[model samples]
Target: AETVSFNFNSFSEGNPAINFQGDVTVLSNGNIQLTNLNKVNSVGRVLYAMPVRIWSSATGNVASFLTSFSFEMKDIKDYDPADGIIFFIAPEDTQIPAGSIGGGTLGVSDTKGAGHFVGVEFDTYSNSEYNDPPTDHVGIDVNSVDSVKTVPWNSVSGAVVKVTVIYDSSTKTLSVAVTNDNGDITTIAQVVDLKAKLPERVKFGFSASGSLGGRQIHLIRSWSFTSTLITT
Candidate 1:
């Protein structure tokens, strides 16, 4: 496996490989904003970093990685604020899929059954299509909008939240943890064979979409990640 790391303190100062589409704003202070407060009429954005080597079929090397970031959802409208964001590892063709509507889908829609990817979502709005709980929560998604595992949480407007995700290649385990401004923590984990689930080289990024009827702003304060390649 190969290695890649990124620490974004300012959007302008962030990695040059980072690319954006749709409605992402690179704030002057270095923070990247996913959406604007009071923004409506449907919008989605996908920001992807440079592609990274995941495994070497010839050398039989495997990949493992860990990522952490801090963000805040602020200026949210009550009762129907909006959709949320997702951190995902996508294949070489990392295109935002069709039907990637805002709100419940979080801009992650079907990719003609050919999409290979994994994501951990921080969902703020609930909808029956995705079987989301009524409250804000975190969920693990594998090639689908329907999350395999989800935990309830109360996310308030203007509160800082930190998230960490890890994938261990040897054990094929994926884990997620979240901490709020008050220092409370929540965690979830699952067994996933990344070698079998993803591509040899992949792009990592963030996606967010919100309903046209309601609006919210998602802001990334900072992020960092380190990947370790292993020769299996």
Candidate 2:
């Protein structure tokens, strides 16, 4: 078989990200399987915030965590939170970059000297003030705050996308693949040497956010992953 049934009894608790202090967590089959919708403090920020924690565990070392969820925001005014997702791999034993905010724990490139992650961002609603390209994309973030590579999707007509990411430390590659409701490849990007610079025992998962005057909803569905890194 290529996968395990992660949704057998999965569920989420906690409120969605409103200011900076909101968060959510999901449990699959009664096991605290995944954490969604995370942020610690709004800190007087004027935008919607999303701070997330990637899964890291001994089972994560073998099972390889997979999670999917959906939600909608207001596309509120004056706020420019991005409509995007972040993929993070941190050692399965302990949280790396512990308690970073605003996709910070999810490996945003704006970290303060925290090199404890390999970040894959599926982004839209770019501000260009912090991260560059100033458009929608799926890209790689390394050492935080610098997008090493990116592939934009503004050429597409729809706001929905199916973004998939995969990393193989054995091959040293991390890849992003996306498809919309029409099922066309909107963006596909990859990088070499994915874990060559990451912490050990990392967890893998997604995080999302959206901005003003654009779409308000975001979702990830039918998500799954496998690694030959494990053996019977």
Q: Each model's TM-score, in the order given?
A: 0.89, 0.57
lDDT digits (tens) for residues 145-195 of candidate 1: 788889998778889899998888888889988998788999989987777
Colliding residue pairs in candidate 1: 10-30, 11-30
* Model 2 residue 140 distance off true place after TM-score fit, in angstroms: 1.2
Residue 222, model 1, lDDT:
79
TM-score of 2: 0.57
Model 1 — which ten-residue stretch has the worst lDDT?
Answer: 107-116
Candidate 1 residue-wise lDDT at 148: 80
Per-residue lDDT of candidate 2, residues 1-232 (tens digit) = 1232232122233424222212332335222212232322211111112222222234343223333322222233344444455655544432323444443223232345245556666555554444557666666776554567877754343344555555544454565666655667754545554334554334444444322233322333334344444423
lDDT measured at residue 220 in model 1 versus the true structure, 0 to 100: 80
Best by TM-score: 1
Name the Cα RMSD for model 2. Answer: 8.1
